[PDB]
Ligand binder design. Sequence first.
Ligand code: MG
Ligand code: MG
Ligand code: MG
Ligand code: MG
Ligand code: MG
Ligand code: MG
Ligand code: MG
Ligand code: MG
Ligand code: MG
Ligand code: MG
Ligand code: MG
Ligand code: MG
Ligand code: MG
Ligand code: MG
Ligand code: MG
Ligand code: MG
Ligand code: MG
Ligand code: MG
Ligand code: MG
Ligand code: MG
Ligand code: MG
Ligand code: MG
Ligand code: MG
Ligand code: MG
Ligand code: MG
Ligand code: MG
Ligand code: MG
Ligand code: MG
Lengths: 86, 81, 79, 205
Amino acid sequence: ANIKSAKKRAIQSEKARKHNASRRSMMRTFIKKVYAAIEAGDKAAAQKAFNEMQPIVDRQAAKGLIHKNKAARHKANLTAQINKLA
Amino acid sequence: MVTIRLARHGAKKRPFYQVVVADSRNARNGRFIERVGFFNPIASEKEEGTRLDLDRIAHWVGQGATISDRVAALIKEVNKA
Amino acid sequence: KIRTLQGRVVSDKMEKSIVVAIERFVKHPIYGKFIKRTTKLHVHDENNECGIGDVVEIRECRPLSKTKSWTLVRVVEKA
Amino acid sequence: ARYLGPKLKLSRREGTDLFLKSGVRAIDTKCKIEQAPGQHGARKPRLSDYGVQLREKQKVRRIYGVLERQFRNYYKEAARLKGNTGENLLALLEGRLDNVVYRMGFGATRAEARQLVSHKAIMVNGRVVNIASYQVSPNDVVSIREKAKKQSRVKAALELAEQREKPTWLEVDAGKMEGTFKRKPERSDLSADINEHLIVELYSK
RNA sequence: AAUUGAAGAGUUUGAUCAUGGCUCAGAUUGAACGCUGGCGGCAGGCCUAACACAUGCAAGUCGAACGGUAACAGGAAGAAGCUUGCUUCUUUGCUGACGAGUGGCGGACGGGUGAGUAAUGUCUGGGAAACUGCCUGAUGGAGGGGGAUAACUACUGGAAACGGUAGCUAAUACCGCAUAACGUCGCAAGACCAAAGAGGGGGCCUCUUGCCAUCGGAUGUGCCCAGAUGGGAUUAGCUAGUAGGUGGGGUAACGGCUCACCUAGGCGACGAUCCCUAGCUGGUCUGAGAGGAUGACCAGCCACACUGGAACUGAGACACGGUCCAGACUCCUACGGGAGGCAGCAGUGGGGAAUAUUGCACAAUGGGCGCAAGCCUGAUGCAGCCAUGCCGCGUGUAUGAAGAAGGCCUUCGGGUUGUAAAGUACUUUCAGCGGGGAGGAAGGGAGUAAAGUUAAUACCUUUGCUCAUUGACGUUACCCGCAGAAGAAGCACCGGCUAACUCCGUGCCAGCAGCCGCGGUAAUACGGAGGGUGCAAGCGUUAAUCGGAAUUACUGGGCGUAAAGCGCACGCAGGCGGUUUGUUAAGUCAGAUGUGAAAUCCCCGGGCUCAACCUGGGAACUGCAUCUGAUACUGGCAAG
Ligand SMILES: [Mg+2]
Ligand SMILES: [Mg+2]
Ligand SMILES: [Mg+2]
Ligand SMILES: [Mg+2]
Ligand SMILES: [Mg+2]
Ligand SMILES: [Mg+2]
Ligand SMILES: [Mg+2]
Ligand SMILES: [Mg+2]
Ligand SMILES: [Mg+2]
Ligand SMILES: [Mg+2]
Ligand SMILES: [Mg+2]
Ligand SMILES: [Mg+2]
Ligand SMILES: [Mg+2]
Ligand SMILES: [Mg+2]
Ligand SMILES: [Mg+2]
Ligand SMILES: [Mg+2]
Ligand SMILES: [Mg+2]
Ligand SMILES: [Mg+2]
Ligand SMILES: [Mg+2]
Ligand SMILES: [Mg+2]
Ligand SMILES: [Mg+2]
Ligand SMILES: [Mg+2]
Ligand SMILES: [Mg+2]
Ligand SMILES: [Mg+2]
Ligand SMILES: [Mg+2]
Ligand SMILES: [Mg+2]
Ligand SMILES: [Mg+2]
Ligand SMILES: [Mg+2]
């Protein structure tokens, strides 16, 4: 970088990339837990995983990591899959 | 945001300003939404050197548009400062 | 009203889809002769109602597939 | 940007008095007005139709002292203006400030009127105008500036204009050295010897 | 008022009429070149190498988010020569401030270029499944905690660039918890989701501002469809995520966007695929128009940023002066490894027929940040250079016969250059020199008084009122004086087309030439001169476009013999369709509504002394869509 603000921006966006990647990995892990429970056939475990995931996707949407439409999509998809199970 | 400012037209040493409503990110003489008047800083006597569509200006203002300092002074002067 | 188009079904071999030839009568920009021109549209046919040769009324909708943005309204006159 | 050469050559080529001298003497006593200039002047080789049109255009240009680009612009304006194009062209030429200064009798010739205009001796409506091609409009007042009222040129020119047909579309006061442009001249007010349709045809080719 | 609009000529022949090509007269340009060159105004100026780039500058800002204190400029606590005034002190984040750092916002704009792109583009008109920083309306919230981390300190690695380790510390940085609907998921019951402070003043209060949520506005952006938008058929077949469906995933959002499975489709002579070329538009040039040509400047859209690729951050980028990788090239190196991207503005080299200054200023307009002051701004305003264009003006004006001298021609009389010189009498624009002197400076800063706010005459906010001030251009425009015709004319042409004619020089030579042609001793055609013609601070030449060319003919042409009827026929697609009534209302026609950016063109006005230029209203944008009517004609349908 040649410009001072551009060097500072590079540092800041690297910091943010690490922070965001940690949060995004965590949220994807919880979503994957819900999907794994759905695949196993366990509704009760599926609902438990969903109740773990729901506040996480809501909060990550509130923080701007994902759009609230994406959080709504995950919630709707998993709820429809869980309900159609028994 | 939407601003009401002066686009600089006319000729060299002889400016003529069009009062435009524009997205402020556009170039001074570029893309604008609506022209709402003009200001001639060198208009002669008996010549109308300022005309402003105050109704359109108030419509855009009550809709979020900001006003540049020169245009605000012109609006005050159309009302006899 | 609702904006619609009317045309001839030229293929119904797709599941829930048809191809409609829309015809327009336009003046030639140079010679002034009125000539016939065709527009072909992939149209959504839920229930697979349409056959090759029917005349259908269609309307524009959101994209439904890569080439489909029109849906069946009704068969004005059957084949 | 001005023709500075001998004057009567132009008249002799056009075969008529262009009034390029003050008119104290007859143009016969100053040149062989009936003979075109140069070694082969006495000859009179047939003129083509193009030659006739060209000579008419040149004669009007030389009467008013207008070069070709300005004259062409005059033709374009006359064609644009509503009405008869040739009459419009003559009216535009008559509207020139140097020509009006000559027609009021402030200048002995159009070139002297042009110098009076250029050298800031002329006022239109109380304001100095030193542009020779300035278009005078009806009800305008053209005056000699106070600093220039003592010039012998101007007194002599007014004397000379006393001995010409007075234009009716103007109103001059030789005492105050003021004149008024009442109206644009009509074609009847101008010479019947000018055949402006030839100029219009020339430029329409 | 805004469509006042249309010219031919030369050349085939012994001659003619026709046909037909070639050529010329016009207008134009981002021009170049040759000859020449005074001033000003306004505009324009790398068309080639999207070649390579030395150097400077083109993006910062905020202390009213934060720890702080490098520096200063001081207010304090403590300090040496020797001018009784005084430095010099030394310390102190106390204060104004402020280097470096955290944080916020900006850096996605502005500016450049036209490589790619023949359709993810552009233009016109429709549309639905979306997001949107700053601005703005409404309603509420704005509690209570926590763990860090730069900076800094100590050590340490490397030549450098750049790092490593450990220990301190802050917030409007970060993270839980609480709270939680008119938000999200859900049929419902329910379940779940946020936040930040900071400044001014005051006998904790109040004001300002910021923070969070939701629903609106506005603006911007993403997406979809129809029509339009180059050439080539000596490119005719192209396509397997291909076309469609179902389900999962994915996106802000619809969608083969993606994947699995199923169906076997989809495109194409109304030109798919392939090949060549190309940014598109408003417009520009030309034209009577219809057209043709074109897309420089200005404005809208798009694409690109050394080449190829990628994502990250972010409201927004797959990011000109950000990141990562790879490549070519240039450079530094201690040989281990590092650094860089002018198609920002200047500028250099180079390529070229050819295209400018390494300027001044943020005064104005606008943009970023800031509560402001202000800081930044190669945007922009200006200035420099260039006759590149357009416009304006000057280079004198009278008078002057001696029709002088010379030149040139001569029939030797004279003719002409000629009122042209000279002489005489005047005028001084512009240039030069002196003085005077607008307007682009709106604001902003201080006080002041009212409100209008409060516990408050305070802070703050609106108004007025006073003060002092703000111009890069700039020796501004402009005006007034001074001296004197002085400081200011060239270029092409003169056989016909085509305005303009003769002498000497030459002898099919030298040479000219757009076409026809000219030159071989008596050349208006070559060369010089005298004379003349046309343009004129330019004039010619070349290039290039349209015109003339009705010579691709839609307007607006032909085919017996000039070029041109398939050898003849049948016939699908296609084009066309006798007559009457009804119906329809697609074509068509009428009205209206929306849209058709601004600029440009045109008409009317207005401002620069005029003009060019600038500019106010109109007209126009001949289009498209929708709605409502008409029904003669054409089309559909029904009956004849
Ligand atoms: Mg689609
Ligand atoms: Mg000129
Ligand atoms: Mg925060
Ligand atoms: Mg909570
Ligand atoms: Mg290209
Ligand atoms: Mg024509
Ligand atoms: Mg084109
Ligand atoms: Mg992101
Ligand atoms: Mg950038
Ligand atoms: Mg750069
Ligand atoms: Mg440059
Ligand atoms: Mg060179
Ligand atoms: Mg700077
Ligand atoms: Mg001033
Ligand atoms: Mg002739
Ligand atoms: Mg001879
Ligand atoms: Mg033609
Ligand atoms: Mg023919
Ligand atoms: Mg024959
Ligand atoms: Mg034949
Ligand atoms: Mg036959
Ligand atoms: Mg037959
Ligand atoms: Mg019929
Ligand atoms: Mg109709
Ligand atoms: Mg327009
Ligand atoms: Mg005027
Ligand atoms: Mg106008
Ligand atoms: Mg009928």
